[PDB]
């Protein structure tokens, strides 16, 4: 609602003192989503109490479901971490296996050719790298 | 005292208001407070989970990319085999592979050294 | 007849202050119940969001598996065919084996640093 709020949170309602009723408006904790509503008698007081229990009953029920979906998540998470560990391992394996094939191909398809310049430039770049880690 | 049995119209009511007042006095908030705690607890579990989810989502994109780069590299090998001896001198891709390979090596131990120091500083 | 009225009128001077106590605490408890539903609702939607992200990861992870399965199926015939196969041919073999070894080393180093960090973030 927009204006209509203002059009019915004034004046007071069901015999409420205009002064106490005005005190509820300012003591309102969330006027964005709430209005002062008079509750008269121990009956409305119990009615509200029982509503709380019904909703808390519903509240707790969601949390149990949600709790359920966390355990699933947590376990889903652990599986996911596991598959990551494998697939990195496989990749490391396959990667090295490809480098072995390319190497065998290079030696073969260059059979009986002079050692060649750019090939000797690797040697150096490779020898310096082996030394840099020893 | 003729129709003054309206004292009975002020007896039954007082109790009604008294026996509810006792009903209010019986109710507590303990359950409503579990709900309050449980929410803060599940937020905490969800948060650690979602944190780790982002950690290894990064791990997964890095992995997907690399698997794809390595799939390209195997296709180089297949291209080499297909190529006949008369067109091998035009097969420049294997050369690019190795040239790329050694600068990847140089870039790798530089990372690994960097990772080592970080891991030393993380221990002090 | 009349002195009784002094009882019930002293009970109401014992039940009024109860009412105000109760109404005060009702307005307090129902504030809690409102905070709850709000926080429950927020929790729930993040819970669904994270479910989604999880399933996205599951899909990417299936994709990766398929990619790697593709890569092996492509790689084994090459390995076999290349299996059914000199100063330059011997020197060149040293050069490219040196690369095979370096790659083997750097991958071990990588694998070891990862396992250390695995023992770390425990």
């Amino acid at each position, epitope marked *: 609602s927009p204006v209509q709020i203002k059009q019915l949170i004034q004046n007071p309602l069901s015999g409420v003192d205009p002064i106490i009723w005005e005190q509820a408006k300012v003591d309102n904790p969330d006027p964005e989503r709430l209005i002062p509503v008079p509750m008269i008698g121990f009956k409305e007081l119990l009615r509200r109490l029982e509503v709380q229990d019904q909703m808390t009953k519903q509240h707790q029920s969601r949390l149990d479901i949600i709790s359920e979906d966390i355990g699933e998540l947590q376990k889903n998470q652990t599986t996911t971490m596991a598959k990551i560990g494998q697939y990195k391992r496989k990749l490391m394996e396959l990667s090295h296996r490809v480098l072995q094939v390319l190497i065998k*191909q290079e030696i*073969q*398809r260059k059979s009986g050719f002079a050692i060649q310049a750019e090939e000797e430039q690797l040697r150096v770049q490779l020898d310096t790298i082996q030394s840099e880690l020893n | 005292q003729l129709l003054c049995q309206d004292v009975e119209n002020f007896q039954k009511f007082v109790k009604e208001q008294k026996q509810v007042q006792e009903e209010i006095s019986r109710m507590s908030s303990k359950a409503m407070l579990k709900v309050q705690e449980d929410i803060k607890a599940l937020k905490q579990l969800l948060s650690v989970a979602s944190s780790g989810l982002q950690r290894n989502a990064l791990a997964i994109d890095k992995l997907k990319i690399e698997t794809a780069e390595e799939l390209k590299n195997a296709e180089i090998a*297949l291209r*080499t*085999q*297909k*190529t*006949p*001896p*008369g*067109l*091998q001198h035009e097969n420049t891709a294997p050369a690019d592979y190795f040239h790329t390979l050694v600068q990847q090596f140089e870039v790798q131990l530089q990372q690994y050294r960097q990772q080592i120091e970080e891991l030393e500083n993380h221990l002090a | 007849l009349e002195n009784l009225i002094n009882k019930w009128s002293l009970e109401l001077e014992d039940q009024e202050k109860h009412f105000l106590q109760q109404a005060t605490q009702v307005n307090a408890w129902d504030r809690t119940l409102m905070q709850n539903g709000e926080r429950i609702t927020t929790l729930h939607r993040e819970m669904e969001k994270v479910k989604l992200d999880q399933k996205r990861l599951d899909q990417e992870l299936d994709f990766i598996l398929s990619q790697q399965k593709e890569l092996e199926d*492509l790689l084994t*015939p090459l390995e*076999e*065919s290349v299996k*059914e196969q000199q100063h330059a041919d011997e020197e060149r073999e040293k050069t490219y084996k040196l690369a095979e070894n370096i790659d083997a080393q750097l991958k071990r180093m990588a694998q070891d640093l990862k396992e250390v960090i695995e023992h770390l973030n425990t």
Partner: nanobody
């Protein structure tokens, strides 16, 4: 020792069709990738079609895309080439090959 022998070539009119074979021996054909290569007498070598060990990962030169089809029977160590909608410019020697060797060839002329 990669040993290859092709055939099925001949002389045909423009628009004609032909089906070439390449018999493989001396190597475990099913594990190798194969190519069809051609050379006209003045020009240089041109790969026209590729295929992988299992008959997947096929490719074609734009020249012949839509006109040629490559295939193989690993059980009979045989590589095929369907050639349709043939043109004078498709006139060449047709070799079957991979990096390890090639065959003698089979002449394909499309008259003009």
């Amino acid at each position: 020792q990669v040993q290859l022998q092709e055939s099925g070539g001949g002389l045909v009119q423009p628009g004609g069709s032909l089906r070439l074979s390449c018999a493989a021996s001396g190597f475990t054909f099913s594990n190798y990738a194969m190519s069809w290569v051609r050379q006209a007498p003045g020009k240089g070598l041109e790969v026209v079609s590729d295929i992988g060990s299992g008959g997947d990962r096929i490719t074609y030169a734009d020249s012949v895309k839509g006109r040629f089809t490559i295939s193989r029977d690993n059980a009979k160590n045989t590589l095929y080439l369907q050639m349709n909608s043939l043109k004078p410019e498709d006139t060449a020697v047709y070799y079957c090959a991979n990096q390890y060797g090639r065959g003698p060839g089979t002449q394909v002329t499309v008259s003009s």
